[PDB]
Amino acid sequence: DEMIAQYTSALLAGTITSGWTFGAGPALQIPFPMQMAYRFNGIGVTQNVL
Amino acid sequence: TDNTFVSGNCDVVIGIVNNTVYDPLQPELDSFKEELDKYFKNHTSP
Numbered sequence: 228d229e230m231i232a233q234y235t236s237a238l239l240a241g242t243i244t245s246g247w248t249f250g251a252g253p254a255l256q257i258p259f260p261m262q263m264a265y266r267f268n269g270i271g272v273t274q275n276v277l
Numbered sequence: 278t279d280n281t282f283v284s285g286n287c288d289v290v291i292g293i294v295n296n297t298v299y300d301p302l303q304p305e306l307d308s309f310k311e312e313l314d315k316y317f318k319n320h321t322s323p
């Protein structure tokens with residue numbers, strides 16, 4: 228139950244800093260105030276709402 | 278301006294940086310301002 232808590236603490240450390248790029252190759256850094264503006268662009272609303 | 282779209286004033290957003298953004302229509306009329314510049318000196322001088 229510690230190594231399981233180590234895996235789920237590593238997914239949260241890459242989905243915050245890198246986003247989704249670490250699931251399809253080498254991890255690339257991106258600020259979190261700007262990753263969140265990429266998730267709106269995949270919904271239908273533009274960037275300026277964020 | 279083809280790559281960018283404008284949205285409102287530039288004070289609400291945090292982390293903005295100052296730079297310049299160019300337009301493509303302005304250089305199209307730039308070739309005619311230099312053309313008309315020579316004919317102005319040929320009328321005022323005499």
Ligand SMILES: *[C@@H]1O[C@H](CO)[C@@H](O[C@@H]2O[C@H](CO)[C@@H](O[C@@H]3O[C@H](CO)[C@@H](O)[C@H](O)[C@@H]3O)[C@H](O)[C@H]2NC(C)=O)[C@H](O)[C@H]1NC(C)=O
Pocket residue numbers: 287294295
């Ligand atoms: C367009 O660019 C100019 C110059 O790059 C900007 O003018 C200056 O921008 C700096 C940004 O760091 C301002 O400094 C800030 O001053 C405040 C108040 O002292 C301070 O709390 C901040 O930590 C920072 O040091 C500077 O005041 C500003 N000067 C003037 C005369 O505006 C300008 O802001 C840029 N235009 C826009 C719309 O951002």
Ligand SMILES: *[C@@H]1O[C@H](CO)[C@@H](O)[C@H](O)[C@H]1NC(C)=O
Pocket residue numbers: 315316319
């Ligand atoms: C300027 O005016 C003179 C008139 O004597 C003319 O011969 C010449 O071709 C003119 N040059 C231009 C560039 O318009």
